[PDB]
Amino acid sequence: KKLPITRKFYAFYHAPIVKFWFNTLAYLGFLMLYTFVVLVKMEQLPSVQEWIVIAYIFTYAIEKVREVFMSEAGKISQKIKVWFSDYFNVSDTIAIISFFVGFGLRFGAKWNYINAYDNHVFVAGRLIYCLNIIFWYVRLLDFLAVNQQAGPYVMMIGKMVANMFYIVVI
Amino acid sequence: QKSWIESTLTKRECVYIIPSSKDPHRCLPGCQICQQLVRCFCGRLVKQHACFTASLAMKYSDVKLGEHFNQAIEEWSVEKHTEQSPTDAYGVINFQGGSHSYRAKYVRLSYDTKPEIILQLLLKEWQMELPKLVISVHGGMQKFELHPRIKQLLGKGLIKAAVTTGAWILTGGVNTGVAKHVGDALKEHASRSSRKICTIGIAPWGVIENRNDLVGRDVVAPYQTLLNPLSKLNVLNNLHSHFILVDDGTVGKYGAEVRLRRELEKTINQQRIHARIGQGVPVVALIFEGGPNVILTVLEYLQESPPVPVVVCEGTGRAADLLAYIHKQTEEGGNLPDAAEPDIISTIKKTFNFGQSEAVHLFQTMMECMKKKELITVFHIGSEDHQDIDVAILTALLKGTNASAFDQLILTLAWDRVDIAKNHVFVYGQQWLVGSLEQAMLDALVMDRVSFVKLLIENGVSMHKFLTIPRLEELYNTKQGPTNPMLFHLIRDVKQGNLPPGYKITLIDIGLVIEYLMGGTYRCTYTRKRFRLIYNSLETKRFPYPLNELLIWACLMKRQVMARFLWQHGEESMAKALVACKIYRSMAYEAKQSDLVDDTSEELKQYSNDFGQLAVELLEQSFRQDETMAMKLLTYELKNWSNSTCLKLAVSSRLRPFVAHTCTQMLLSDMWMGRLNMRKNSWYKVILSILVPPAILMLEYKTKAEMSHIPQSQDAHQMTMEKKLPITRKFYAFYHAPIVKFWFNTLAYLGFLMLYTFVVLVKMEQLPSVQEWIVIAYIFTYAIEKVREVFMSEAGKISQKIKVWFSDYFNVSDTIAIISFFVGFGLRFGAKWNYINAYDNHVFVAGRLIYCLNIIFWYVRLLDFLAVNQQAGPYVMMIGKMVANMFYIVVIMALVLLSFGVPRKAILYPHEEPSWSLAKDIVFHPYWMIFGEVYAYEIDVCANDSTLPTICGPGTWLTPFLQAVYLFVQYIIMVNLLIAFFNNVYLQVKAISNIVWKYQRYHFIMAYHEKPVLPPPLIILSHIVSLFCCVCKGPKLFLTEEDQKKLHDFEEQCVEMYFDEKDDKFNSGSEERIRVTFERVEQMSIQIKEVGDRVNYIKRSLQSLDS
Amino acid sequence: VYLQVKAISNIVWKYQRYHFIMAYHEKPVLPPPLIILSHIVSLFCCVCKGPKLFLTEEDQKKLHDFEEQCVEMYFDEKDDKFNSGSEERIRVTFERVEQMSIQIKEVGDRVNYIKRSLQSLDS
């Protein structure tokens, strides 16, 4: 029993297994809040739950920018071509961009003060939230794919969609 | 200085320069030519010494002014005027890659190295193993060219002597003469056996080329093998591993190592060959094509204590062949044959020109080498004489140097060579001492020498007289063999942690390990009263069954090859295999629950499955011979294994293929019948006879002779010892049959559900109805019986009874069902009634609703009753295995569910306060869509035929698109993925479920021998009697003594038939017949070509006799 | 199509654990609501100022000996499996029985050259 006290904290928080659950628990708490935001009535100013959501997706987007620039290959345009080759990285790009399109229409709109959803710009911003949240539930399969048993089925669903295309066309 | 070589080893330089004899060559101006060409008497010339002290003396003219008083010219000895100095050389001498990389080492040491220092060099520093044989090859330098035929035999024989004994081969090192032919033997038959072969070349630092390239402290130097045309010097041989290099003067001066190599042989022969054998390492001398100095070396070996023997070859043709010819024309140790000395000395001088003067001096050496014939082994090639020189090398260490046959046998034991021991130690006429063969057995068991245990048993050693208590104390307490590092962890677990540092293990301690591994109520023969008292006293000091005692030993010491051998010898073969399956299995479970750097649990688990497979294959062999006698083998007490049972041992091991084998299933099917002959009855008749007790007496039963293979109770046996079976016996036979106890509980259980379904569907008043009290009386008395199953089951530890019982599915489900019933009955019964309207009391509602939910437990429990059938049972066990296997597909289906419900609720209902109804609404409708409900008129809420016209609003046109995607993913992808999952996993889950069903009929059927006759509404009558007879005051298979004798003869006969048909199936396979053809056609190709050469030796006389 | 897509999906899943696990050696400790604390530090230490397997010199030597030994064992067991197969043993039998048929017929002719001298030396 070696490893004094301040060494055992470095060992824990830098283990990849710990970084995973420490991102997973934060992601599940994110969806619980972002499910609350989208089911409950939205007022003019965002709620405290809704700012936490925005703070997540914003800071989550910065980390995706960092993964691109600081990955492997010296050529900057070669960093791009590798990263847009994965499924959920393309899905994150659509999810991050469409959120701030939706937050922009939501937040930067002239309110009515007599009845909500007479502003069609605010409706369109809210309805993008309701559709953007699908990206973030399907992303739980991305978290579920760490398991030895679940993982191969998640990768299987995509391969079966491609293989049955022409039966579905018929 | 970070160099063990520098503190111990020695270079040495000729610091004092004496010139050559008299003459500088040419070139009149004498003042320059004394430096240009005149050598030192060292041997090298004056410009290469460099002499840090005498470098200041070479400027005058040289060291040591002139004529120097001619007696003093010779004065250079290597002791006086040749100064020692540190290392200058060690490293890898890696040869330039030919076939492979071929590394080696070198030292460059002195001549005056002490014999203890050179021995310290080879072992510790160079990480070499202490050998078991030294083959010092000796011959003549530079001669050459064996024949091709003789090159294969002498090549193959030298390798198989060294790789099968782990030998050192001492050569000359340099590529001239012998080492060229030693290494070419290594070229042909290497098979990377340099791990076992360590050829050590002892050369000088003289005639070797590129000596200055090897200069360096810890230098991996490259070394070339190119035949230098202009040169005549010698290179090292590439296929050596270690080099010892001795310098007396310098380049030239071709001898300094003859003493040091010989003194190395003295040091090895003084070392013990093994830490159990007092005999020293033998040294042999192999003689190829020789020379004049060879004859002085051969004679120096024979004239010594100990007399090192000599092996001489022939066919090469030199002094080697002289020793072949001189030894041939000579009987036992007398002087000479008829006077043919002019024929001998003439043959001596054709090798080297001596000329009748000192060729006579060779003859006094040839008459002392014909003298000691017993230590000389000639290998005649051309008549397969003595079969492959590796036999003849190792046989030569046994013929001479007269010693005991014990000394001959234990020498072969260290070499791990039985074919020498069988064919040259166990020959006819050899006389043995009284306790020598026993000491050989004790050595062979410890050293893990299985094939010598086989040889000593065949040649007279009895294990009954051999294996004593103190000797078997030793077999556990050895580190001089392959030991188990796990046995010491098992001993401290049963002695509460005390561990003294010496700690000779006792057999009282081993028995506590066996009882811990076998588990349950196992009691070894070491921890009983009879053994402890005779263990204090120290024939009765021997064992009655020794091979039961060693088979446990071999398993606990993790010696599998020894365990498979000791299993085949002795009685009770199928039982010992099931014990060993249990012993390794328990050690495999202890290995995982222990902090070791070496797990070795997968090795033990494989060893457990090997003996388990042997048990199944003996049951299959016994079942084919006689079905009835094989069922007796499953259930007779063993009397040497704690009165246990081959079923009880296999069920303890969870060895499923034995319990699921058709022999045990016939036995379980026959214990189910009891004394009913259900081959000529029907299940209609058993049920009818439960309801009509006088219909019992119209049922065909089984006789005493039709039940000799079925275990019974003690008092049930008394009923059989006496159309037999009078009236009051036929009632005992019926109501105690397990098949009858089943239907008599099943009918009571179905009547229970019919009542408890009535109670829960019909209105409940304040006081319980008569139907409802019967229900309570059932579950109460049913709960008492479950408490009795826990306490009175198997294992003495009360908390271990708990852990086994909560491991089954329906026993956990019964616990929840029994507890939640009385929670519900408590809220139901013990509540203040209202008397104006029922179900205004929320405590009574909650009690009733628990009944409505508790009844699900009792319908699902009908699957527990349905699982007795051969066809339904495996499907019930299959349902559970399929739920576990499809978990992660269903999880994905649940995330797709939430991916749709959350946006649909968000789009369609934009004006919601926080409520727990939101959790309901995002799950509810999307779940029912999986099951056929499209909600057709709630799609497109803005349509005219919509049933939700007020939900139409901004953006509700998105939801038909969302639901189209949802159901495509659910039915068309995920439901069909789940159909496909079950199809392609069906066969291997149906198969596993059949074995699991067949395995657990044992615990099922053996439970109904202990259950009472009477069902769980009336069972309280049986629990009064069970307390009455216990305070006031399982089954066995009975056999008479003439049926135990017939059973032991059956067990022995079926094992004999097992190994015979196993050997006949192997020897009659196509794989084995092809290779024995391959090996015989190989030998026939050798002979016919060699007979084809003899018949060509015939036609030389045809031309002669035709003349 | 289940078995061959389930099989391909297992290998693809196992392949991409590398890019997955080696990504989490470079990700920050702290999750994406609080990760902005880690991006300040990452810009602080960069402007102001992957993993390796360390081995001592006596462990590199033990590793190179292991690599060499396992390659030697590879070609030996590859040659022993080929020379011990039923296909190769039949043909080496085929080629030797062919040569033995040649020799015995040709030794069978020599022994017929012997019986010419039997009638001679019997006379």
Ligand SMILES: CCCCCCCC/C=C/CCCCCCCC(=O)O[C@@H](COC(=O)CCCCCCCCCCCCCCC)COP(=O)([O-])OCC[N+](C)(C)C
């Ligand atoms: C590696 C790859 C993955 C990473 C991708 C990361 C990049 C993601 C990129 C995201 C950018 C997406 C576009 C932003 C929105 C513009 C469009 C729009 O509809 O605007 C609207 C809002 O117009 C405004 O002026 C208010 C916007 C407030 C700020 C929020 C948007 C920017 C945040 C971005 C933060 C992202 C940064 C994340 C960190 C880097 C315009 O319409 P309106 O004004 O509402 O209506 C006018 C009429 N009315 C007033 C009568 C109603």
Ligand SMILES: CCCCCCCC/C=C/CCCCCCCC(=O)O[C@@H](COC(=O)CCCCCCCCCCCCCCC)COP(=O)([O-])OCC[N+](C)(C)C
């Ligand atoms: C091997 C393993 C398997 C075997 C497991 C076997 C053990 C199973 C264990 C079972 C025990 C389970 C708990 C019992 C009920 C207590 C909880 C409860 O809600 O009580 C209620 C009844 O309170 C009473 O005082 C009336 C209870 C009458 C007796 C029935 C319960 C005990 C029977 C147990 C017989 C089991 C023995 C079986 C044979 C051993 C309290 O609430 P209330 O008073 O209704 O309401 C008060 C307010 N009001 C008056 C205004 C309405």
Ligand SMILES: CCCCCCCC/C=C/CCCCCCCC(=O)O[C@@H](COC(=O)CCCCCCCCCCCCCCC)COP(=O)([O-])OCC[N+](C)(C)C
């Ligand atoms: C073991 C394996 C794990 C299973 C998975 C997890 C299981 C899912 C767990 C879901 C959690 C439960 C949701 C209900 C939440 C509470 C409801 C409540 O408070 O009030 C509601 C009561 O309604 C009910 O109590 C009925 C709830 C709906 C039935 C759910 C069936 C399961 C379908 C899904 C199964 C697959 C799930 C797929 C997963 C994504 C009503 O609201 P109220 O405000 O009380 O009154 C409103 C008045 N009004 C009615 C007159 C209008």
Ligand SMILES: CCCCCCCC/C=C\CCCCCCCC(=O)O[C@@H](COC(=O)CCCCCCCCCCCCCCC)COP(=O)([O-])OCC[N+](C)(C)C
């Ligand atoms: C980004 C990642 C963060 C990490 C997560 C932890 C940090 C986040 C934690 C807390 C932040 C909460 C916001 C602060 C304000 C509190 C007020 C409040 O919520 O009141 C509500 C109570 O609601 C709750 O108590 C929870 C509501 C969200 C549902 C999910 C809770 C769990 C999420 C996290 C934990 C699960 C973790 C699961 C995995 C282990 C009452 O409703 P209202 O607000 O009066 O009305 C709403 C109307 N409005 C919106 C129009 C105004």
Ligand SMILES: CCCCCCCC/C=C\CCCCCCCC(=O)O[C@@H](COC(=O)CCCCCCCCCCCCCCC)COP(=O)([O-])OCC[N+](C)(C)C
């Ligand atoms: C504040 C309270 C905190 C706790 C609460 C939260 C609990 C935590 C969060 C979520 C639940 C997870 C708990 C079980 C984890 C088991 C460990 C395991 O084996 O993980 C495996 C999968 O690891 C994953 O992370 C799989 C995905 C789960 C997290 C993301 C949610 C998606 C699935 C659910 C979404 C909803 C489902 C639908 C119903 C609503 C990885 O391991 P393995 O390959 O099996 O091998 C074992 C060895 N190993 C671990 C070293 C790798």
Ligand SMILES: CCCCCCCC/C=C\CCCCCCCC(=O)O[C@@H](COC(=O)CCCCCCCCCCCCCCC)COP(=O)([O-])OCC[N+](C)(C)C
């Ligand atoms: C108009 C009405 C429509 C009618 C119906 C028809 C339309 C609907 C049809 C199809 C919808 C399904 C979309 C998935 C298809 C992916 C295919 C694919 O290529 O996958 C790739 C990965 O992708 C995955 O592994 C997918 C994992 C996420 C699940 C998809 C979301 C579904 C659940 C949420 C839905 C919730 C529902 C509620 C929300 C609205 C794999 O590709 P590959 O072939 O293996 O290529 C080789 C590997 N390679 C990628 C590395 C090169």
Ligand SMILES: CCCCCCCC/C=C\CCCCCCCC(=O)O[C@@H](COC(=O)CCCCCCCCCCCCCCC)COP(=O)([O-])OCC[N+](C)(C)C
């Ligand atoms: C625990 C194990 C026992 C073993 C079983 C045998 C012993 C059990 C046998 C008999 C016990 C019956 C109780 C005695 C009182 C009789 C009155 C009666 O029932 O009247 C009813 C007639 O109902 C019937 O005749 C049957 C009602 C139960 C349905 C199942 C019958 C078969 C169960 C057993 C045989 C099937 C065996 C199947 C397998 C071969 C009329 O209704 P009520 O009662 O006027 O109104 C109810 C209202 N209250 C409840 C609010 C008051």
Ligand SMILES: CCCCCCCC/C=C\CCCCCCCC(=O)O[C@@H](COC(=O)CCCCCCCCCCCCCCC)COP(=O)([O-])OCC[N+](C)(C)C
């Ligand atoms: C190991 C086993 C543990 C068992 C623990 C025992 C649990 C005992 C628990 C509770 C005791 C209940 C007694 C009353 C308590 C105070 C409330 C009260 O008096 O009345 C209230 C009762 O409200 C309810 O909800 C009653 C039902 C609660 C039990 C819920 C099921 C628990 C068992 C799960 C299944 C078993 C699973 C177990 C399987 C393992 C209201 O009624 P009232 O007041 O009479 O008048 C009417 C309303 N009025 C006041 C407005 C007029």
Ligand SMILES: CCCCCCCC/C=C\CCCCCCCC(=O)O[C@@H](COC(=O)CCCCCCCCCCCCCCC)COP(=O)([O-])OCC[N+](C)(C)C
């Ligand atoms: C008062 C009137 C009394 C009579 C009436 C009551 C009749 C009796 C009660 C019930 C019906 C059973 C009658 C058929 C029995 C056939 C015999 C047989 O082979 O049994 C097998 C299964 O044995 C079982 O017990 C299976 C489960 C049936 C009893 C429990 C009810 C669950 C299934 C139904 C629930 C509802 C279903 C849904 C529809 C509502 C066992 O045998 P085997 O492996 O096939 O091998 C034959 C050799 N052997 C017998 C030596 C082993």
Ligand SMILES: CCCCCCCC/C=C\CCCCCCCC(=O)O[C@@H](COC(=O)CCCCCCCCCCCCCCC)COP(=O)([O-])OCC[N+](C)(C)C
């Ligand atoms: C919120 C809404 C939920 C949404 C849906 C999802 C939830 C529903 C999901 C699942 C429900 C099904 C439950 C059974 C699962 C058992 C799994 C298992 O491990 O089985 C074990 C035994 O178990 C059996 O053999 C089961 C036999 C009883 C049948 C189960 C009841 C179903 C019928 C009544 C239902 C009637 C319906 C009406 C009543 C309400 C076998 O385990 P194993 O893997 O083989 O392990 C190896 C062997 N070992 C055990 C010895 C170690």
Ligand SMILES: CCCCCCCC/C=C\CCCCCCCC(=O)O[C@@H](COC(=O)CCCCCCCCCCCCCCC)COP(=O)([O-])OCC[N+](C)(C)C
């Ligand atoms: C894109 C694919 C090809 C399709 C091409 C064709 C379509 C072009 C694409 C999109 C069309 C978007 C506008 C259509 C609405 C017109 C009618 C209307 O007013 O509807 C509603 C508002 O609707 C809105 O305010 C729009 C909301 C924004 C939707 C965000 C993108 C949705 C698609 C996902 C992104 C796309 C990618 C998805 C992946 C495939 C009605 O609200 P209202 O105006 O207040 O009506 C009065 C109501 N009242 C009487 C009750 C008060």
Ligand SMILES: Oc1ccc2c3c1O[C@H]1c4oc5ccccc5c4C[C@@]4(O)[C@@H](C2)N(CC2CC2)CC[C@]314
């Ligand atoms: O092989 C077995 C053959 C027959 C039975 C069992 C066996 O094993 C048991 C087991 O295990 C299961 C696992 C999953 C699903 C069902 C079961 C079952 C069922 C069961 O509970 C059951 C019958 N009886 C009591 C019931 C009164 C008959 C007890 C023994 C039992």
Ligand SMILES: Oc1ccc2c3c1O[C@H]1c4oc5ccccc5c4C[C@@]4(O)[C@@H](C2)N(CC2CC2)CC[C@]314
């Ligand atoms: O083998 C892999 C094992 C585990 C994971 C991946 C693997 O490969 C990836 C990949 O590829 C897929 C293709 C089709 C369907 C699913 C995926 C996935 C999923 C995934 O996105 C995912 C987990 N994490 C991020 C998530 C935080 C965990 C990143 C890496 C990832």
